[PDB]
Paper text:
The present study focuses on the ancestor SMS from the hyperthermophilic archaeon Methanocaldococcus jannaschii. Biochemical and structural studies showed that SMS is made of a SmsC2B2 heterotetratmer wherein the SmsC subunit hosts both ATP and [Fe-S] cluster binding sites. With respect to the six components of the SUF system, SMS has only two components, SmsC and SmsB, encoded by the smsCB operon. The SmsC subunit, consisting of a RecA-like domain and a helical domain, contains all the structural motifs of the nucleotide-binding (NBD) subunits of the ABC ATPases (i.e., Walker A, Walker B, ABC signature, D-, Q-, and H-loops).
Since attempts to crystallize a [Fe-S] cluster-bound protein complex either in the absence or in the presence of AMP-PNP were unsuccessful, we used cryo-EM to determine its structure. The reconstituted SmsC2B2 complex prepared for crystallization in anoxic conditions, was rapidly vitrified for cryo-EM single particle analysis, and the structure determined reached a global resolution of 2.64 Å. The protein complex prepared in these experimental conditions revealed that the C-terminal residues C218, C239, and C242 of one SmsC subunit coordinate a [4Fe-4S] cluster. These three cysteine residues bind the cluster in a solvent-exposed hydrophobic pocket consisting of residues P40, L216, I223, Y235, and P247. Although the SmsC2B2 complex could in principle contain two such binding sites at the SmsC head-to-tail dimer interfaces, the two SmsC subunits form a strong asymmetric dimer with a single populated [Fe-S] cluster binding site. All residues coordinating the cluster and forming the hydrophobic pocket are in a single SmsC chain. In contrast with the unoccupied SmsC subunit (apo-SmsC), the [Fe-S] cluster-bound SmsC displays a folded C-terminal α-helix composed of residues 227–241 and a short terminal loop. This region comprises the two-cysteine motif (-C239-G240-K241-C242-) coordinating the [Fe-S] cluster, and P247 closing the hydrophobic pocket. Additionally, residues of the C-terminal region extend the dimeric interface between the apo-SmsC and [Fe-S] bound SmsC subunit, in the vicinity of the cluster binding site. This interface consists of a cation–π interaction between the side chains of the K128 in apo-SmsC and the Y243 in [Fe-S] bound SmsC, as well as the side chain-backbone intermolecular hydrogen bonds from the N131 in apo-SmsC and the K236 in [Fe-S] bound SmsC.
Residue numbers in the entry:
A (entry chain C): 4 to 237
B (entry chain A): 4 to 247
C (entry chain B), D (entry chain D): 28 to 316
Write the structure that this text describes.
Amino acid sequence: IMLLKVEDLHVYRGNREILKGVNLTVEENEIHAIIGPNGAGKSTLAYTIMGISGYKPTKGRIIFKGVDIIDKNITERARMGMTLAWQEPARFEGIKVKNYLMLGMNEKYKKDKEIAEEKIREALKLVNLDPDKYLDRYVDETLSGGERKRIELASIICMEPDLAILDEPDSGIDIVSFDEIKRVFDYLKDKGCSLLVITHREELAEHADRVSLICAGEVIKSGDPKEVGEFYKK
Amino acid sequence: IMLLKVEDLHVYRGNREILKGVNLTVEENEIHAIIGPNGAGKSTLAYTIMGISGYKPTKGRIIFKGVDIIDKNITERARMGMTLAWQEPARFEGIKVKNYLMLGMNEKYKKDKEIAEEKIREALKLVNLDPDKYLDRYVDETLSGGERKRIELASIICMEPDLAILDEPDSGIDIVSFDEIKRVFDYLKDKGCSLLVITHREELAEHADRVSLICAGEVIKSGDPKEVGEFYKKECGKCYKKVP
Amino acid sequence: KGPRIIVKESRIIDVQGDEGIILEGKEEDGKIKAKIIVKKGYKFKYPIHMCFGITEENISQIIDVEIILEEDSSISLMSHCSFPKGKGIKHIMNGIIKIGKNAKFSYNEFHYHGMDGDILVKPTVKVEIDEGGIYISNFTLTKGRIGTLDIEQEIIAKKDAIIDITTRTYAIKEDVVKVNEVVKLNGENAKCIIKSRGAAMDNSKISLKLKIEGNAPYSKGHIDCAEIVKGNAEVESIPIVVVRDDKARITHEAAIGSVDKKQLETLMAKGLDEDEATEIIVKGMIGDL
Amino acid sequence: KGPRIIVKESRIIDVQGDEGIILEGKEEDGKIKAKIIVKKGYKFKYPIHMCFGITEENISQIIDVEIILEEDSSISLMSHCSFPKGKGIKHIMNGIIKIGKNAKFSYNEFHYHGMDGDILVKPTVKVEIDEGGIYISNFTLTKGRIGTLDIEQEIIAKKDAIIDITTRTYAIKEDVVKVNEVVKLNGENAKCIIKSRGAAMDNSKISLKLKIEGNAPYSKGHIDCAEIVKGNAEVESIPIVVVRDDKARITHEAAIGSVDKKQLETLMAKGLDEDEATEIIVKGMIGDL
Ligand code: SF4
């Protein structure tokens, strides 16, 4: 069975629409990228599927694992195996990095202290952060913007969801090259996760299994990245 | 005579040593780019040459146009042909965009109001803003991080120094390819400026005339843009320690 | 021409109105009485104008005014005060304003004074906002001597209402400034912003009191204050916040004294010195170039 | 063992000193009298200890204490209060503290209470700081019921002096909290920080009053305040700033009410519920876990 169906979806914020008649789907073990111009509704989809406050379907329907989710809050949607990473994460006064990474940790790793402490060290090295410098620091305003965004991607590796939504995963990171990011997408797909990626990089879109183009709140074209990116360019 | 020379420079931030004896030189009409891991020396070097308060050397020298500058204040350094652009620029209560771009303008443009007026519209078109909707807006908290950064780049073009120092020049701008930025570097060099550029991207470093790599407060490599770029990709892109 | 009120030397000279708008003005017990009403559903394209002028000495003005907005209506008005050669002046005004369902109101006042320094200005205002109503106001005193200034405001608001308040001043020589204003948020989803800006010089002294009460669910409020001190002037500020509900949130910030160091260093790096840079920042704060 | 003062059942049970520091204490006129004197040039590897304990009904105790710290010297002071049975008890203390040229002082106070609410705690202190001196102070009351709490501080500082002050509280049932603190920066280059954190629930009442006066060249100050409201609790806060020099600067920041929405939604998107997510945010702010 498919992971996700979005069907005839309409959304308005204040006076007028941001999404109109959208139709979309995601398979098991798939990397799917969404592309398009700014203001086309890309982040408004990501908040609407996860169910963040102030976004609700006015018409249409959303189905996850063959079950309807419009009756469900953020906690109930997260318990089914869905999650989100924000484009610019929040800061917490008085919470340590090593305590933050234990929240929502997958039911395979969470059971034992050794297996959890090594999962945290593996996740920090995989984003190029030295564990011995960062485990005892706070998740507050004393981290730089690039450090805080690398810590949020180490959290997704510890949760290991069935579906993850990333809104600009390369924005605000001090990347040497995009081969830092593609190494994380390879690691998650190897464990069986499905990814929805919203991005402005043609370099990351080339790496997806399928790509879709959203413009002015409507889906225009989808399929092979080599067709739809070159169609979008003109 | 070299435009800038830096000799055996050390710098402290309270009880912490950050720079550990760097040596640098910049020639007339050159683009020189500095790369490496963030926080390891990149921004403190740029503040120390401009003389920004709380950034002062414990040993070494800085020589500009053959004069040793260790006694001179920010206004005296700016009078003889040096300027800085910050990573996150300041916000002003009640100052309008057409008043801000006029303030530092080069002494060859300041003498006629029509030459000053055309230079500001040329400089706004070069950074892909639309002049006639932006000139009357305030340089305040209402602007987004990408609007405020495009306005600071229009100021360097209008000010036209002998040496410009840029700290993270694309940071805060959402952009699909760097060819907007490379066009501005080419324009400044055609007018006869020299650029000192601080970055994390390889795509901007391969456009420079020379490249140097700073790690843990020291120079690790310097030379041809292409030989240092391959080392940066191969070795630094899989390193989590960030200290040799 | 348009709808208006005109007063000179404490005498009424003109008052007139369009269709859907009613204006009244007359003299009683040495005071001026005035009234304004806009009827159900009318939204107006342009402001009402009220104008005051005093060229004489030892003159006094007392005004009482009532303003009524009916359902779905919208209006704004301008106050102009010119006191050239002004000496021994008193200006006092008392306002009652009522804002109906889904209605909108905005108010502006601007003062021009000479250098002769013997002036008292004293506005007192009380306001009620019904379901979904909008209120905006602005006071500016930045040209000439202030003399003595007293501000009093009291605002009470119901559900879905919105409030936005501003004051801007510039004080010199022996000028004295007093500000006191209170907002009560008594319905769900109501919100407000309060702003003050200015600079003080010479021997002048300034006191600011600002209050918000959050009494109802989903209420929001913000206060922010900035003041620049030069010479041997003195400044005091006292912002107050109270919260009585599980679902309300209120925040505040302020900075008082000399100019911000990063703004000063940014202008020095463009070729100015401290005295050139400090005056550019002050001219921004008071609304000049 | 180490330099200490110990009291139980309103009676002194031990006072002891060490080489370079003099300690004394006695009972007079219904009060405890105590002394600490530190000799010129001495510095110590440890804190000094104060201890108070009550395990019986209807007790009232009063302490007057004087602390002298001479040139180039340093100490740290630890005080513990445990009150496991709350049946109608009074704790009152008055402190005088003097710190000399280049001296360093720090004070910590901790309270542990039971489940009964008939408690009153009343600490009062006056502090003098001479050139280049340092003052640190911390009050913590986050376990058991509070009852009624009422705190007063006055501080005066000379040139090159450093001050910082912290208080943390958690109020439940019918608890009452009041705090009143004032700092005068009278010397050149003097600096301070004032910080408060807490949460309130049930039928609790909180009032906070904080003041900085900036009177002299290159003096600097900051006030930082945050409070979380739940249930039928009420909160009031009044920060005050005064400045009287061309070269001083003071800043203030505050937030009062519910937790922030983006912080809460971020924790629910990781599979927690809203009562698990709210209590994680509170224990970080009050520094419990
Ligand atoms: S590889 Fe060497 S130069 Fe590059 S970041 Fe690591 S330690 Fe620094």
